[PDB]
Design a binder for this molecule. Sequence first.
Ligand SMILES: O=C(N[C@H](CO)[C@H](O)c1ccc([N+](=O)[O-])cc1)C(Cl)Cl
Ligand SMILES: [K+]
Ligand SMILES: [Mg+2]
Ligand SMILES: [Mg+2]
Ligand SMILES: [Mg+2]
Ligand SMILES: [Mg+2]
Ligand SMILES: [Mg+2]
Ligand SMILES: [Mg+2]
Ligand SMILES: [Mg+2]
Ligand SMILES: [Mg+2]
Ligand SMILES: [Mg+2]
Ligand SMILES: [Mg+2]
Ligand SMILES: [Mg+2]
Ligand SMILES: [Mg+2]
Ligand SMILES: [Mg+2]
Ligand SMILES: [Mg+2]
Ligand SMILES: [Mg+2]
Ligand SMILES: [Mg+2]
Ligand SMILES: [Mg+2]
Ligand SMILES: [Mg+2]
Ligand SMILES: [Zn+2]
Lengths: 125, 176, 128, 37, 136
Amino acid sequence: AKKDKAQQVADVSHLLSTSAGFVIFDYTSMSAIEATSIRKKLFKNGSKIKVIKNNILRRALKAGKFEGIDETAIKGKLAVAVGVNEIVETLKAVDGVVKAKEAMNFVCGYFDNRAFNSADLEKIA
Amino acid sequence: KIGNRTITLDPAKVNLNFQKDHIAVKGPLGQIELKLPPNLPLKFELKDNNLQITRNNELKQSKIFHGTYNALITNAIIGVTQGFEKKLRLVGVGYRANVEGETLNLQLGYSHPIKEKIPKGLTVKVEKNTEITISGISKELVGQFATEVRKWRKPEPYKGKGVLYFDEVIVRKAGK
Amino acid sequence: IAKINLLGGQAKPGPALASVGINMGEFTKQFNEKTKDKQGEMIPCVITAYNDKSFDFILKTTPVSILLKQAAKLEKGAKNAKTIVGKITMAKAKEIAQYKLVDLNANTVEAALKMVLGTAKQMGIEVI
Amino acid sequence: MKVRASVKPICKDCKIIKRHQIVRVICKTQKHKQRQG
Amino acid sequence: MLQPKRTKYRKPHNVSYEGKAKGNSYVAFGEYGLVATKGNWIDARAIESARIAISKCLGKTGKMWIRIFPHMSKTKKPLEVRMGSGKGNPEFWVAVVKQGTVMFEVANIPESQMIKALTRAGHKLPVTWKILKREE
RNA sequence: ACCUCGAUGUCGACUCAUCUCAUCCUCGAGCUGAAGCAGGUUCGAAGGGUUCGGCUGUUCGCCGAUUAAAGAGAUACGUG
RNA sequence: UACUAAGUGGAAAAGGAUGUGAAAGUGCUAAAACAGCAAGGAUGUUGGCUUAGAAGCAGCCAUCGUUUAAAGAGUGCGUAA
Ligand SMILES: O=C(N[C@H](CO)[C@H](O)c1ccc([N+](=O)[O-])cc1)C(Cl)Cl
Ligand SMILES: [K+]
Ligand SMILES: [Mg+2]
Ligand SMILES: [Mg+2]
Ligand SMILES: [Mg+2]
Ligand SMILES: [Mg+2]
Ligand SMILES: [Mg+2]
Ligand SMILES: [Mg+2]
Ligand SMILES: [Mg+2]
Ligand SMILES: [Mg+2]
Ligand SMILES: [Mg+2]
Ligand SMILES: [Mg+2]
Ligand SMILES: [Mg+2]
Ligand SMILES: [Mg+2]
Ligand SMILES: [Mg+2]
Ligand SMILES: [Mg+2]
Ligand SMILES: [Mg+2]
Ligand SMILES: [Mg+2]
Ligand SMILES: [Mg+2]
Ligand SMILES: [Mg+2]
Ligand SMILES: [Zn+2]
């Protein structure tokens, strides 16, 4: 209901407030066996892959007083990849996996109170 | 809903002359003419690159007309800009067709020779003896040609013989 | 991709592979080379059937609930779920879990623990 | 085509339609064609 | 074939079915019931057909109650017999169902199966049936 | 037991047929446990056709040989 | 002032139907509704008796659990399986 949604938006906003790195991905053509494989290869509590609602992600972003990420979450497939402390190895790991995949897009993310572009994601690895 | 669906069209080459009961659409290909039946319960408005169909009342036929002619306008615009194509897979042991002038002839399995007249505005090409492509600017006419070519040999379910449509699957039976 | 059943000690036959273009005779040595540590036991193999021809194969653990029967000291479980015959402690359950951790896709070891309970409920064996 | 006084779907894919003010049942399977509803 | 073991009088007057619902008006043993909407004479043969049909489509734990019973008999003069020479001999037993009497009831099996079970029971009977539930 | 006992001739056969469709053949189509040939069922359709004999008063019926078929009925169980 | 689209009116039942109008409740929805489209739609495993065989889709022993957004001892088709 509305109360559960209010609770949900509050906790995800808190999680993104206390976090340090974010990157957005799409859910196009990778298997659930592969999905379980990604969970085990990360194996770090700081790194977490999650399916988030597009609407809930923007509304939590408004509560996070950030800006510029809106272009990422428009007419797009949205993932959330939260990393605590160190995020470069998580980005390196996910980059190696998408290369092992068949096809994949890759949309701009958020880290260290700064935003990046698609090519800027290529060098963040 | 179809009635309240945008029909965004580029003004590059497509114009739409709205007379009382004669809609004219002109573009890259031939012109398509649509006849409006009298007392049509739906008024068009012509802004820049956007046509919006509105109705006067809440009648059943009013809603039915509002949807149907939006689709017809959509279909007319698409054919004028890029046309329509249908693909037929004529498959068999001695089945083959080819085009001479205005008549498409087929030799399916029949002692009597088979000829078929092509209507105006439709072009049918035969790249391979087992292949027929009907290209036109009016959807219903190319559909009528495709189905009337099919009527000579409807695809049977025991083997693949017949004038099949492309990417059309039939239920198979094993006639031991 | 084909999940094919081949005995660990006898894997040279099998005509189905030949339909895809796999080099059957060259690959027989690879099939037999890495299964000698588990001789006699039946070990299926997953085959990445594709046109690259460098078919990478992966072995697979024998199916579960046969070690449940061995640990319960009974050949066949009860034909009715309500009648409870076999009893299994946590030590026998955990040995199976660390054994079966290789084939399982669970992140943690307690998840593998409750797999033993899950299959034991199907066998009807009480978890004590 | 099967002519029956009562027409009802046989499989979950059967769909009831109204053509020419007569109710018929159409479906992927041609063995399930009914009329005279 | 439901039948009274003995009756005091072999040939009784027929019992009318026009009127409201006398007894057996509310579900009181099960919680779904097949109510009638048109009074008619229905015989013990129809009960057995409907009861066998419902029982076949029942399960392993469902339980049923039969309310109506064919107490009254009816006669039929033999064919090719001219009027006179007394009343005919009793032939078949019929239960008198009035508009509003609950005939069959079901319980102890999920909801979907009981509607289907009551449906097949009512298709075996001439009266126009309708489903009712038990008051809380 | 309503008309007819101051009279409505009742079976079968012959001649002439007419009408209905719940269609036997011919015509069109759907499904098939419809490979082809030959079938089964249902739907549409009454324009035409729908055999000759043995036994019996026979209708009916069995049998013989053909035919695309040897239809079901009504008309005072049509027609002195 | 409404209703009917059937010439119903201007003859009929058991039964069947997204015909249409009126009313009374209840679920979601611009924190996005329904349909459709684009993706995934899992692992132990193909669980085990059982059956020549069934192991996602023969009868069963029942009618598992984790990862996870989701996934069913599966929705059918179908495969000797
Ligand atoms: O009397 C005759 N016919 C009467 C007329 O009242 C009537 O038509 C009739 C005919 C047949 C019949 N029968 O077959 O028993 C009885 C009466 C004739 Cl015999 Cl003249
Ligand atoms: K007389
Ligand atoms: Mg008399
Ligand atoms: Mg009298
Ligand atoms: Mg008279
Ligand atoms: Mg006289
Ligand atoms: Mg005379
Ligand atoms: Mg007819
Ligand atoms: Mg004529
Ligand atoms: Mg003689
Ligand atoms: Mg008569
Ligand atoms: Mg006569
Ligand atoms: Mg006659
Ligand atoms: Mg008589
Ligand atoms: Mg005369
Ligand atoms: Mg005469
Ligand atoms: Mg004379
Ligand atoms: Mg009338
Ligand atoms: Mg209805
Ligand atoms: Mg209504
Ligand atoms: Zn069907």
